[PDB]
Structures are given as structure tokens and as C-alpha cells.
Amino acid sequence: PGRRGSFVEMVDNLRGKSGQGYYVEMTVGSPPQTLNILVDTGSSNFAVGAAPHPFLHRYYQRQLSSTYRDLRKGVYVPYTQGKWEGELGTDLVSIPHGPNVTVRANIAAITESDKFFINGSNWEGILGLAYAEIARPDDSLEPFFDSLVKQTHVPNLFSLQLCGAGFPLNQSEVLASVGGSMIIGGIDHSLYTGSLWYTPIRREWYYEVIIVRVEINGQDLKMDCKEYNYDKSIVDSGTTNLRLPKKVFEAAVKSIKAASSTEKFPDGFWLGEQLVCWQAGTTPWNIFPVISLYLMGEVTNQSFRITILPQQYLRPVEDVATSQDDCYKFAISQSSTGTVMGAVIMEGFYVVFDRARKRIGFAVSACHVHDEFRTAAVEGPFVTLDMEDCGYN
Ligand SMILES: CC[C@H](C)Nc1cc(C(=O)N[C@@H](Cc2ccccc2)[C@H](O)[C@H]2CCCN2)cc(S(C)(=O)=O)n1
């Protein structure tokens, strides 16, 4: 049967890109103050710029909102890159291209920050969509999505389609382009092809999952599966790269280098620091391998796999001389805090955060970048034993 899209109001409500973030328009306060907010499934605080900053064109003005409530408490939030400090409060919030509801939510008014805001990113705040366990200052600060579900009839689920262009976008092109969809309270069947396969959410803090096998061009990386989830594996729209635990990163890059060995790349490229360029239209996608991550299934002893292409893990960037060449950075990097399935991997898939059923669904995205010979894939089932042992304690 033909797939129908039943959430037209929310389709195409995101803008942005993997390197700077995907954001949604929101309003806060009375009268409403419009702000662009980065969608982050890897944190749990809703926070907005609330004081002048060289990189902000607008910010939340609490003194102009008649519905503002002061919680008289400070908050500090550190991330992998950047940190900020602010003042807690509550106010009415709406999502113009979202459900037609207004809710009262906790808002951290950012007063000081370091390496958080990004010049020309067009966003002024962050929407932490994960669970209260990781909220700052503590788990008593109800996150936005928990408030939304508690105060309305919106189902306890959201889904994300992050759309990478496959080429660089400047600030003006980002403003004029659709970056994807955040469907609040449902699944839009126009956003994916094939079937949705679900992995259990291991624990409700981050969106934690369990990886049970890793392949590079079908070749098993052959590590003990606990290594892939050391000390956790999470799905994170607020991180650019696919981040892997140090030992896994070292094995994966050795395997990716071996598969792409018909061309030699500098160490700076593999460390994700240096771009590489090819003459216009000549990027040799076929020399780079596909990467498959097998995820624990919902059925006992069953797994499924998601497969990404180099069009996902090679992030388009502009040249140092803005030439006609096609340039990229390697968007796989090391981590000391476990695996992070970041925006570059999410760009291949439609991802369903089914909080109600404690599971995350993946399907091939209708907007993923590919070539005439290969596409991203979500396939299953595979018989996989002792998958619970892949989880790190
Ligand atoms: C998608 C666009 C953002 C700007 N790119 C990022 C953000 C972070 C980060 O700390 N994300 C934060 C959120 C954030 C967004 C924008 C700016 C700063 C931080 C997120 O909450 C993480 C922290 C730990 C678990 N989830 C890390 C990386 S990395 C390591 O790939 O270089 N890339």
C-alpha cells in the first residue's frame, strides 16, 4: 500500500545542518517571543539566550512576558563542546509548526556562556528532549516533553527526520532550505521508505540503546560487543559526529583506511580536523565502505542492522578558498563517554523516539543522500544471542 503523510502541519519544520545543529521555531512568553531552538535528544534542559551575545540576533526578554514566573534558582549545564549558566523560570511555550497547544514549561534563561552559541547558526536556544534523570540542576526540573505530555493530549512519542543536503550551505541557504521534520506526537509515513525496526531504550536517561555487532563493508569489526557500548550508546541529535569509544574508534578507522586504501588521506583527515577536496562531481564514494551497526531487537535473540554510506559519514564543508571542488570532513571521532549516534548518522534515517513503548525505531530516510549504486538500509532480522551481555554496567 501507498504510504500517506498524516502530519502535514509538522513536516518540513526544521532548518539547519549537521555541523551547526537542526532547529525548530518556538515561541515563549506573552506576547509570544519567537526564537529558533536547537533540537537535542542528548540533553534534558530547555534553555534560551536571555541576554545580549555577539552571536545572538535576538533573545528572551523576561521583563516583557506577563506569564513569566521566576524560580529564583541558578543552573549550570556543561556539554562536550560548550557550557552555559542561567536562571530558572517558567513561561508559556508554543511550537508554531507543531501541535496546536500551549504549555507552561521550565526555561533556563542563559545569562553567561562559553563556546555554546555558534556564529551564523540561526538558533538562540536548545530543547533537551531526553529524560529528567540527566536534567540540571537535578531530576526535579521537569523537561519540556514531559510537561507537554502531562498538560495536553499529545501522545508520548516524537520522531525526527534530519535532512543533510549532501553539499555545503551558507547562512542564507540554511535560512531558505528545509532541514527536516520533527513530528510531535506521531509518525509521518511520507518521511521514510521500507519498514520501521525498533530497538529497546535500555534505561530512560539519555536515549540509551545496545549495539551488538559492527561491520565495515560486511567485515565484522570482531570486538567483544561490550566495547561498542562502553560506557553507553546513545542516539543524539545535538552532536554532529558518529562518536565511538577510543578502542572501537581505533579499530574502525583501521578498517575504513584499509577499505579506502586506493587513496591515501592525511592523518589530519582521519582525526576529523582537516578537510579533503575533489574536483567538482568526482568524489570517489565507491572507494569508501558502508558501515553497519546492529542493534538489539524487541524480539528475544533478534537483532537488525542500520547501514550508512560515506554520503552520511563524510560531512560536506566549504573549501578554504570557496572553489568549485567538493570538500568534506570525516565525521567519525573518538569518545571517552561511549558511542554517540549523532546527526550525521541520523541523516540516513527517520528516527522514532517512542517513549510510550520505551523503544527507538529506525527506517531509511526519504531524504538521505546516496548515489545510483548504493543506499542506506535498515534490515532484519538476524539471530543474535546473549545481547543483554553487550550492555555495560
Ligand atoms: C549538532 C550541532 C552541534 C553544534 N554539534 C556538536 C555538539 C556537541 C555537544 O556537546 N552537543 C550537546 C548539545 C550542544 C548543542 C549545540 C552546542 C553545544 C552543545 C549534546 O547535549 C551532547 C552533550 C553530551 C551528550 N549530548 C558535540 C559535538 S561533536 C563531539 O560531534 O563535535 N558536536
Side-chain angles (χ1 to χ4, degrees), residues 1-149 151-393:
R3 33 187 65 259
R4 305 171 279 102
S6 303
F7 294 91
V8 175
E9 61 280 3
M10 291 179 280
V11 166
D12 293 352
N13 63 352
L14 303 184
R15 285 188 303 177
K17 58 191 188 178
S18 59
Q20 292 185 341
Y22 284 93
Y23 62 83
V24 68
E25 185 176 273
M26 298 185 75
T27 73
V28 295
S30 303
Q33 295 178 40
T34 298
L35 297 171
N36 284 333
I37 304 298
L38 186 143
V39 168
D40 182 18
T41 66
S43 72
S44 299
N45 280 82
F46 176 36
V48 300
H53 183 278
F55 302 163
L56 293 181
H57 278 298
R58 57 197 176 173
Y59 56 89
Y60 173 43
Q61 296 185 280
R62 290 165 288 169
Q63 78 281 14
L64 306 183
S65 176
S66 64
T67 47
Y68 167 69
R69 293 177 175 175
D70 191 353
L71 288 171
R72 290 177 40 251
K73 191 178 192 195
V75 56
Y76 165 73
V77 177
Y79 302 103
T80 311
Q81 74 172 234
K83 60 188 190 288
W84 54 254
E85 211 152 42
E87 300 174 347
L88 290 168
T90 77
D91 210 336
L92 300 189
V93 182
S94 301
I95 302 168
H97 302 289
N100 299 305
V101 295
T102 293
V103 300
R104 182 170 285 276
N106 291 310
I107 307 173
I110 299 171
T111 60
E112 300 294 342
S113 60
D114 182 55
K115 298 178 213 174
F116 178 65
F117 297 116
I118 298 168
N119 193 20
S121 70
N122 205 48
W123 54 260
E124 294 97 41
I126 185 160
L127 182 65
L129 290 168
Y131 299 97
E133 178 72 27
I134 62 166
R136 305 297 180 113
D138 55 52
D139 70 358
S140 67
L141 192 73
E142 184 173 74
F144 177 80
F145 205 83
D146 287 272
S147 299
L148 176 63
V149 169
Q151 296 172 39
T152 71
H153 293 112
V154 175
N156 190 23
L157 177 157
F158 64 92
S159 58
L160 289 172
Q161 188 205 45
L162 305 186
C163 297
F167 51 87
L169 306 167
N170 61 39
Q171 191 184 353
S172 290
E173 293 169 310
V174 158
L175 289 162
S177 299
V178 163
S181 305
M182 174 168 61
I183 311 304
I184 301 273
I187 301 169
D188 187 296
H189 302 281
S190 76
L191 302 182
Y192 70 96
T193 59
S195 297
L196 275 163
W197 282 84
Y198 289 94
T199 193
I201 288 171
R202 188 192 186 204
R203 180 179 143 210
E204 297 153 300
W205 61 314
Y206 288 98
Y207 285 106
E208 182 185 9
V209 297
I210 301 171
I211 294 164
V212 302
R213 177 181 166 96
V214 172
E215 292 175 359
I216 303 305
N217 257 2
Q219 184 177 21
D220 180 15
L221 205 58
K222 224 187 178 187
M223 299 180 79
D224 182 310
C225 63
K226 283 169 122 55
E227 298 285 7
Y228 302 143
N229 309 291
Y230 173 63
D231 62 348
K232 59 186 162 294
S233 289
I234 67 169
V235 184
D236 189 354
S237 64
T239 284
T240 295
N241 288 357
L242 166 61
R243 308 187 65 220
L244 299 169
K246 188 169 194 271
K247 292 170 77 196
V248 180
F249 177 78
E250 291 170 347
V253 302
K254 182 178 186 181
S255 184
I256 297 166
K257 277 172 170 179
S260 61
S261 75
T262 60
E263 196 160 329
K264 174 76 188 178
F265 300 96
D267 291 343
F269 170 76
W270 300 108
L271 289 171
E273 296 168 344
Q274 210 158 34
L275 63 76
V276 291
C277 296
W278 287 275
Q279 180 186 324
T282 73
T283 304
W285 301 114
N286 75 96
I287 76 172
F288 286 93
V290 300
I291 296 170
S292 300
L293 303 183
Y294 290 66
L295 297 166
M296 175 183 294
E298 284 206 288
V299 174
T300 307
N301 296 323
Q302 273 198 3
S303 63
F304 63 94
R305 67 187 179 208
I306 64 173
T307 300
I308 58 162
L309 305 181
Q311 283 92 336
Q312 279 74 59
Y313 65 81
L314 298 184
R315 186 168 64 80
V317 299
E318 198 41 77
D319 205 344
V320 200
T322 64
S323 68
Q324 260 154 43
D325 289 1
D326 287 335
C327 309
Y328 310 86
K329 284 188 183 178
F330 184 59
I332 304 178
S333 58
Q334 71 169 68
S335 167
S336 62
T337 63
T339 291
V340 183
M341 294 169 57
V344 298
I345 176 151
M346 293 182 69
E347 282 177 357
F349 308 98
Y350 181 43
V351 186
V352 176
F353 295 80
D354 184 353
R355 298 159 52 107
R357 295 190 59 179
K358 209 176 162 175
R359 62 188 190 162
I360 298 162
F362 289 84
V364 175
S365 181
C367 72
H368 84 273
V369 177
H370 60 90
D371 57 45
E372 61 265 56
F373 300 118
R374 300 200 282 215
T375 58
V378 178
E379 298 171 309
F382 304 91
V383 172
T384 315
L385 311 170
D386 301 299
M387 291 185 292
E388 286 178 38
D389 294 285
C390 297
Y392 178 80
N393 303 302

